[PDB]
Design a protein around this nucleic acid. Structure first.
Ligand SMILES: O=P(O)(O)O[C@H]1[C@H](OP(=O)(O)O)[C@H](OP(=O)(O)O)[C@H](OP(=O)(O)O)[C@@H](OP(=O)(O)O)[C@H]1OP(=O)(O)O
Length: 67
RNA sequence: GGUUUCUCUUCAGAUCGCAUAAAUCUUUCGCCUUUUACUAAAGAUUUCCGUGGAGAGGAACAAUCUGAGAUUUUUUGAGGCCUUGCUUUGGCAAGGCU
């Protein structure tokens, strides 16, 4: 989120250079798309293993003794 | 002596990635009642999204194509011919020859 804010400020301060000001119509999304999808390939297998443990506790039950 | 494409197998040792995330563990911290969740640095590993080379199979389109394949200077007649030594008989070692 800090890198998204920094990319927003970099885009804004490369953009507001001449006659454009701080209006609400600035459009660019590729850098945040890169950041959150590289986060998504990071966060995928931990999510898959946590959801697999969730499904195993849901359907195989909870090992109360267990490990 | 086709191409494109799909699948499988194998080697990935190149920035396999002109890209970049996460997790565990060993720790130092930051934070700090405590548990996950924590902060940012190192070490030790891993996983994921990708990647390259090779081979096989399949499919659709090329249906061949693609290859491979002389007289006149110095690199051709200054060509012939004889005697002695030796014949070792293809002519050889020396002389006058045109
Ligand atoms: O300096 P800017 O890049 O132009 O930031 C401004 C604004 O106020 P400030 O001028 O005082 O900084 C906000 O501040 P920051 O978070 O960037 O510090 C921010 O608002 P958000 O927090 O919602 O992002 C953002 O607003 P937005 O992203 O909607 O454009 C933006 O606003 P403006 O550029 O329109 O003035």
């Amino acid at each position: 989120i800090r890198m998204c804010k920094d990319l927003k400020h970099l885009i804004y301060y490369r953009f507001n250079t001449g006659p454009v000001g701080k209006g609400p119509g600035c459009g660019f999304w590729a850098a945040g798309w890169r950041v959150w999808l590289f986060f998504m390939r990071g966060i995928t297998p931990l999510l898959e293993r946590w959801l697999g443990n969730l499904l195993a506790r849901q359907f195989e039950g909870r090992h109360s003794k267990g490990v």
